[PDB]
Amino acid sequence: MDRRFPPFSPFFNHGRFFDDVDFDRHMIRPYWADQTMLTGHRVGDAIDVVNNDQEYNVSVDVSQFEPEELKVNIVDNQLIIEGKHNEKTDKYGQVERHFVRKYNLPTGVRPEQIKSELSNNGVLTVKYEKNQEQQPKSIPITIVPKRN
Amino acid sequence: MDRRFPPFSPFFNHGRFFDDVDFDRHMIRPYWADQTMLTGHRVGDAIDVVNNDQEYNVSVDVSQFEPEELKVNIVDNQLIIEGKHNEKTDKYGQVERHFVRKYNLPTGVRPEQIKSELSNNGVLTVKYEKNQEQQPKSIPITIVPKRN
Amino acid sequence: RHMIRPYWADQTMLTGHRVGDAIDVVNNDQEYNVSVDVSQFEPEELKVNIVDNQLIIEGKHNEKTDKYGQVERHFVRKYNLPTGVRPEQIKSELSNNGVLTVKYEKNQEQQPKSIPITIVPKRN
Amino acid sequence: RHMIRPYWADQTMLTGHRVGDAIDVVNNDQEYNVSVDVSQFEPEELKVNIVDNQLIIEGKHNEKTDKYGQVERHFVRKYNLPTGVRPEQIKSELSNNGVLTVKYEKNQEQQPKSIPITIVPKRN
Amino acid sequence: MDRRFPPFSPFFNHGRFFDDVDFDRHMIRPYWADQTMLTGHRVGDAIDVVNNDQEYNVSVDVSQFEPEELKVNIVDNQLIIEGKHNEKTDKYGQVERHFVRKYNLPTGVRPEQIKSELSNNGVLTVKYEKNQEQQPKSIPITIVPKRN
Amino acid sequence: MDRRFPPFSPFFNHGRFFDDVDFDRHMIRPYWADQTMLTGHRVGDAIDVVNNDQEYNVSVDVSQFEPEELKVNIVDNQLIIEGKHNEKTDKYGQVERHFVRKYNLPTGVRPEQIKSELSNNGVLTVKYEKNQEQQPKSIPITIVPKRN
Amino acid sequence: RHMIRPYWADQTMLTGHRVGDAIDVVNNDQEYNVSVDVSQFEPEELKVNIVDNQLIIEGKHNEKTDKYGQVERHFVRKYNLPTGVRPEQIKSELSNNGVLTVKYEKNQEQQPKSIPITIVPKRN
Amino acid sequence: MDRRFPPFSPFFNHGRFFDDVDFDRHMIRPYWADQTMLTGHRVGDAIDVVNNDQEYNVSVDVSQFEPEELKVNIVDNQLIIEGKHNEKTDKYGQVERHFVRKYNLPTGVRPEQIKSELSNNGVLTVKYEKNQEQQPKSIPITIVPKRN
Amino acid sequence: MDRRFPPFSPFFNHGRFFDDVDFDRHMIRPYWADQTMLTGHRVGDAIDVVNNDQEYNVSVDVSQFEPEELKVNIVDNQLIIEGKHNEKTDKYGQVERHFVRKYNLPTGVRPEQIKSELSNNGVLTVKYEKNQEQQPKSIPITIVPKRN
């Protein structure tokens, strides 16, 4: 995924129906064999930490870790984003990376409406809106994954 | 899926093992090329809103949107079900549809035990039981998706 | 039209209908007709525009409130204009049954002057 | 022409020929010529019409009686008009050898005013 | 048929058994894509009309029409041979041809023994023998068509 | 034949030349496996019997029998149309049908010019023109069947 | 431009460049722009013509002599004109950096009069 | 040639024997579809003109023309290198290029021993040695071209 | 080559890239199996001998011999064009042909600038320009043959 024309469905001119439709887990494939490179090409990992009276948005570059290798937990009033991947063999050699992050949390932040999104280039953004609207009510619905 | 005999596993007589087992994301495929048609054949979108002293069940017809295009959020004490899909090309032309819904919420409704289900025909039902039992305790377990 | 508003106890609307319903399109060298069912939008809430030689059909109405929860309809339908279509004079009709018909007769009813009969008809 | 009538003892006609004989069609961006052999039909029996932006060539004559059995010729030939063809001024020629030539020069002899030389030629 | 070596069975050296044995309906195939051409190369359509005291033979060139497009009927003491074909698309364009023929009939001609034959080159000959022999008796037998 | 797009040549977009060109004997194929159905969808079998001073046309619905199973004979001044087919196995079971018809004949009807035609939907029409023109002369010509 | 002439001891020219260098062409229903790098030809030595509804770009200069051996540049570049392109008003621009931009905006900014609102809008 | 790994034999790891061994006429193939580019990446066309008492070497960049499109002739005491190619269609459009060169010749230069070579990158070098050795004698031998 | 559409590259619509690109050595292939024929269809072999004060052009029809079978040498002030081919087997039989030519040479003709060309139809033309310009200088460059 995100490597050529036949990935990245439905933008797939070689049939458009069933040939090369797959999940986005193959985003790191171009970087799997690429070693002399940076954190998926951005400056730093945590792009910004916005903490004001109207929003709370934090953007993290996670292009070097697959979404399966990325997990977020909250331990003792700290926003912890930790991503560990096994040793990966490339055209150059073998590399294992591991990062642990912790972030303080402002008072009055409700975690029941915090939404986190991953962009195509490999940036995970955690967005929160301050205490002006919304209620802790949440009604989820079934979402069918896009296999092929 | 839900289009012929070889979809809808395990009801698949042409091998029964590994040939045509796929996720339910292809439910809208018969309606993908069908335009002169209705909201997946039901009367209206929201089938019913049950609000009594024993249950709270709301059924919504979502047959015109894929489960990936359906998302539910709660904003300022309102049950909001919003589903947006990109323009879809069929045998007739191009159509883009978008619906936004909001619903008031009765007092004393706990969102921690509200369960939403999607039926085969494309109906999303949000069910809630009144304040007589259950506790906010929830113990989830890993569920492996059914790919093939 | 105005039947979106009575959504109380009538969450299935008065008439079941989905945004972006159309009947048929006839495309040939004689005519170009586009019939669209717009029964769920008021006459003043229907907008049709042609941008970059392409027909755009959009129907949107204000969110109609009721006892339980307000409902809104909004869709954008796009039809490609074939070659020779002149947006400056595209015909349009809205029947009383909620069907909007967009026609185009190509204005090709001219009598052919070129009638070779005897010798060197030429041109003009 | 008039040689269809002498069919007595001459069932093979004076000149063997089949309805719908043509020589060549030249289709390019400069000209559009259609040459058709119409030697078996009288000049007043040849009709050429353009319907729905398409060229129609039809040749029919009255059944020419003779000693044994009358003979008639009737055919309808259809040629599609390419893009940019204007039926209102389509050229046509009928040579003396029974060949009908339908021409179209596209009227594209205009001099291009857009001659960029020094700076910001723009338009008009 | 009548276009190359592999047609025209049994004169078919590439197997001789079952490969390219077909009916003679493909006689016009060489002329299907050939437009700048004549009535299948003969002078005129009706080759000759023989009307004497011993025979009645009329030969008609029907090479421009398939045998399926050729039909013969008798209307009001006239031998009518009419052949109409739909518009045919070739390498040059589209052509539709139609011919109607009528022929007077000598007195004393019995139609019960008139035989019409089609030659390979596309000539239909109607042969009749004068009133000297034969009887109106006719005993037909089953003829199996030669498919392959 | 008369079942999908690849039958019914030359209306055959998948090659247009030699792939799926076949005789019209497969007209009953859609009804071969269809049992809960009518006489090929018309009201009755004999559509009409026209008997006037200018024409004699009789239309018979024969959609339930193949043309090979349909045969017409005249016995003792009666127009007899009889069609018998063997037992046919479908998705439902086994059925054998047989019909025998007889029709009186008006005086002065010449059988030498009576033409019978079968339409695509399976209707056999017997047409006759009254005694005002035509002669018993008939000149047949060879017609090549359309195999492929 | 005039830097072709100093070819003495400078056989690699002042700026390396090949005849027929262009930047980008944008082809859509809104605009048709053709940008060509013509830095190696003088403004008076650049000729652009449209023949048979097709854009021709040619750049040729006189052979520029020097101490050792004269050098000349001559090329003919051909661009096909898409459908709807009017050569009589084709835009053209020549930037100061030796880039010649040939534009075409399609003149499709007309306001669509066909606005169906209530009943039988028809045409005109 | 000079585009990937399987060209440029014998440096061809995918078999090494007979698969992708071809002549060097495909040197311009990478530049065939490349238009926004320079004279095969060098500064100018004629790299240098060496004219001294010991050698006469002139290097010309001919990377934009195939060796078949390059021809050298001498007209009236001038070294003329002229290369014309037909219009070439690329991913961008159509381009036709033509160059004519003329070069003066020092006195005492014998053309019988002048050797011209083409390098891999597309540079044609004309080398001459001054009047100190060699004789006009030349004994050529048969050279078999390397096809595959 | 010069026999159908798939030869004569790049005029090759069936792929245009690598399928049927070959050298022009197959020019005689149509005449290889053709015997009842002439010297590749021209009148005579030597078309003309131009000998004036401005040019010296001689055109020879060599369509009956392959370029490999054609060799030109000069022996004792005579232009000799000799072409010998082995016995060739065709649909008719076996034929061996051999021709020897000699031509006188005008005084003052420099052979260092004489150019000979072979046309597509099989005509070899030897062209010479009189003593008004050019010098015996000749600078050749490498030309890659066009294999495929």
Residue numbers in the entry:
A (entry chain A), B (entry chain A), E (entry chain A), F (entry chain A), H (entry chain A), I (entry chain A): 1 to 148
C (entry chain B), D (entry chain B), G (entry chain B): 1 to 124
Anything the authors wrote about it?
To address the basis for the special chaperone mechanism of Hsp17, we solved the structure of the Hsp17 wt 24-mer by cryo-EM. The oligomer has a cubic shape with the symmetry of a regular tetrahedron. The edges of the cube are represented by ACD dimers resulting in a 24-mer structure. The NTRs of the surface-facing monomers are oriented to the outside of the oligomer and are partly unresolved, whereas the NTRs of the inward-facing monomers protrude towards the inside of the oligomer and interact with each other. In both types, the link between the monomers is established by the binding of the I-x-I motif of the CTR into the pocket formed by the β4 and β8 strands of the ACD of a neighboring monomer. We were able to generate a pseudo-atomic model of the Hsp17 24-mer consisting of residues 25 to 148 for the surface monomer and residues 1 to 148 for the inward-facing monomer. Hsp17’s unique trait is based on the specific arrangement of the NTRs which functionally separates them into two groups: those involved in formation and stabilization of the 24-mer in the inside of the cube and those accessible for substrate on its outside.
Small Heat shock proteins (sHsps) are a family of molecular chaperones that bind nonnative proteins in an ATP-independent manner. Caenorhabditis elegans encodes 16 different sHsps, among them Hsp17, which is evolutionarily distinct from other sHsps in the nematode. The primary structure of sHsps shows a conserved organization with three functional segments: the α-crystallin domain (ACD) which is surrounded by the highly flexible N-terminal region (NTR) and a short C-terminal region (CTR). Consistent with its presence under nonstress conditions, and in contrast to many other sHsps, we determined that Hsp17 is a mono-disperse, permanently active chaperone in vitro, which interacts with hundreds of different C. elegans proteins under physiological conditions.
